[PDB]
Copies of this chain bind each other. A is one copy, B any other.
């Protein structure tokens, strides 16, 4: 955005009836489990669908508005951002990346799925380039996004984008346009587009 950018857009189906919860101060928390699929044609020309399952967290006002009304099988449009969190030992891992929904909009499930992420930040390390047996290039890179704290996000790219990305270095700025995918558990971004935000100006010494 002004440097750091973090935006997520999803349209998926609820795999479970929403779980409502309140904090002692009285903050409503509503977690939604969404599912959908992304397609792509492989090197053998085969059209393939890759499923994705993402938990989405709504907070407060809107969480209350939607609580109890949402049912399993419901088609939902979501707009939010990726939030990274780190902690000691308890919730099963030290770090986690979850989608925090800014707002949600249930859609008429007919009488369709969407998965897009836009990130802009700076590399927290040199890119890690590797190759597959077939000889396909793949890279892994860490991104620091700060638009109250910095969010550390993992990005993966393939083929030419992976080769171009391999020339980047720790500290470099990067704009990512891709999809939110999963993999212990890890949520990361699969890049569809990668671009370098130009720097610097106006050294009027």
Contact = CB atoms under 8 A, between A and B. Distances in A.
Interface of A: 1-2, 5, 9, 11, 65, 69, 75, 77, 79, 103, 105-108, 112, 114, 118, 120, 175, 177, 193, 195-198, 201-202
A77 B114 contact: no
Contacts of A11: 193, 195
9 contacts: A11-B195, A69-B202, A77-B195, A105-B197, A105-B198, A106-B197, A107-B196, A108-B195, A112-B193
Contact of A106 (B9, B114, B118, B198): B198
A81 to B, nearest CB: 14
Contacts of A2: 103
Contacts of A103: 1-2
Given A107-B198, A108-B197, 6 more contacts: A1-B79, A9-B118, A11-B193, A69-B202, A107-B196, A108-B198
Contacts of A108: 195-198
Q: Which of A1, A105, A118, A202: most chain B CB closer than 10 A?
A: A105
A11 B9 CA distance: 18
Nearest to A68: B202
